[PDB]
């Protein structure tokens, strides 16, 4: 409705950069440990993007310490602070769920130049 | 339960409904008035009227789309040469339902569905 959209567009963030699935992205989130807010980095491959305006989200997969870690960030949440596209990739799907069984050389994605 | 859903099942499976409305939309373009049952007449508006709106822009691509929906070149020719420019100013609502009583074989509530600019 008009009432919902007015409440949601005033909470959105005006600086979300344009990224596609397959872009190697680097997300800086806020971490409150003890009492000092620090800014932990998270960097992997965008395997899914779900666009719903304020409720928009995206999924980042990385291979951390041998283990694969998926993390579904809420885009307009303030606990994420920066989103930076490190390396943009060339895929032909909207959601890269097949990377959950590809490792090493098989899970490469080529670079979307230009 | 059927909350906020759309489309009538009409006691058919999905491929039969698509092939029945493919035949029936071509039959309505061909004769400009047909007599069918009232649930099938109301559900036919969601098929024919997107085809007529498709026919307002005569491109080669839209001929291929309208052929992919109907699979009859005589209907696609009638859509873009006649019913395209006939309805070129109307903002939708290209057809009209006229309830015509009850079928003698099974008491089915029938209806005439016709194009607006017919008579």
């Amino acid at each position: 409705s008009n009432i919902i959209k007015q409440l949601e567009q005033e909470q959105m963030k005006q600086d979300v950069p344009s990224f596609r699935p397959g872009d190697t992205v680097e997300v800086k989130v806020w971490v409150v440990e003890g009492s000092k807010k620090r800014l932990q980095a998270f960097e992997g491959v965008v395997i899914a993007i779900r666009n719903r305006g304020l409720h928009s989200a995206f999924t980042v997969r990385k291979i951390s310490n041998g283990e694969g870690v998926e993390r579904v960030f809420q885009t307009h949440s303030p606990v994420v602070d920066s989103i930076s596209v490190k390396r943009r990739g060339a895929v032909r799907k909207a959601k890269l769920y097949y990377l959950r069984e590809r490792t090493g050389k098989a899970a490469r994605i080529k670079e979307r130049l230009n | 339960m059927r909350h906020r859903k759309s489309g009538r099942q009409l006691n058919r499976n999905s491929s039969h409904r698509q092939a029945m409305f493919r035949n029936m939309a071509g039959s309505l373009v061909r004769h400009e008035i047909i007599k069918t049952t009232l649930p099938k007449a109301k559900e036919l508006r969601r098929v024919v009227e997107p085809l007529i709106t498709l026919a307002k822009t005569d491109s080669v691509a839209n001929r291929r789309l309208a052929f992919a929906r109907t699979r009859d070149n005589e209907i696609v020719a009638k859509l873009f040469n006649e019913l395209g420019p006939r309805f070129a100013s109307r903002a939708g609502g290209y057809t009209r339902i006229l309830k015509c009583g009850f079928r003698a074989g099974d008491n089915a509530p029938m209806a005439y569905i016709e194009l607006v600019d017919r008579s």
Binding site: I3, I4, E8, L54, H55, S77, V79 | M1
Partner: protein
């Protein structure tokens, strides 16, 4: 304390500064205007009768339109009634805004739930299904046994059986109110209230505190 009559606009979320997402339910609350003040001398109890929204003039009936004309107020889409506490009073044509909830902290939201229709005992009363294999003859989601043998030639009252589920008055208690926006007539409560989108809601301050 009295409550107010609103409408379920939908659900959204309020991102706090701390990184917490609060799932909220937007309830628009237009100006509730009173239509009748009830008292002990005439009615035996103390309450007010409010109205909200608008209604088509050709559709409000002459008995109903005469009731608004006595109070001298525009016809609203319904008539609800809130019991008065002691030391609490209102005039007849008085309008009541959403600023009444400016300093409450928890509310109870009463609505009519969604209509599930005729529901079976797996869905309605959370019965266990029987075995889906191992020989079961036509009895996968049936309620099973319903009584005992000859001792009570009879099934007891209130036995959990299939029937109408939902489409009835339910009240969710102690909802945390998040934001009271008087300028655009809104009310944000934490969590999910009953009812579909666009249905009437009765928001009262919480009685269990």
């Amino acid at each position: 304390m009295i409550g107010l009559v609103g409408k379920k606009v939908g659900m959204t979320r309020i991102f706090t500064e701390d990184g917490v997402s609060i799932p909220v339910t937007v309830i628009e609350v237009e100006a509730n205007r009173v239509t009748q003040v009830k008292d002990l001398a005439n009615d035996g109890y103390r309450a007010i009768q409010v109205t909200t929204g608008a209604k088509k003039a050709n559709r409000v009936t002459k008995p109903e339109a005469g009731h608004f004309a006595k109070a001298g107020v525009e016809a609203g889409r319904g008539l609800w009634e809130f019991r008065l506490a002691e030391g609490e009073e209102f005039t007849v044509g008085q309008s009541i805004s959403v600023e009444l909830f400016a300093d409450v902290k928890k509310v109870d939201v009463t609505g009519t739930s969604k209509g599930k229709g005729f529901a079976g005992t797996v869905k309605r009363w959370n019965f266990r299904t029987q075995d889906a294999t191992h020989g079961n003859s036509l009895s996968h989601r049936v309620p099973g046994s319903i009584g005992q043998n000859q001792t009570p030639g009879k099934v007891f009252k209130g036995k959990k059986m299939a029937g109408q589920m939902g489409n009835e008055r339910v009240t969710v208690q102690s909802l945390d109110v998040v934001r009271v926006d008087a300028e655009r007539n809104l009310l944000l409560v934490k969590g999910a209230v009953p009812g579909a989108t666009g249905s009437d809601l009765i928001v009262k301050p919480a009685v269990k505190a």
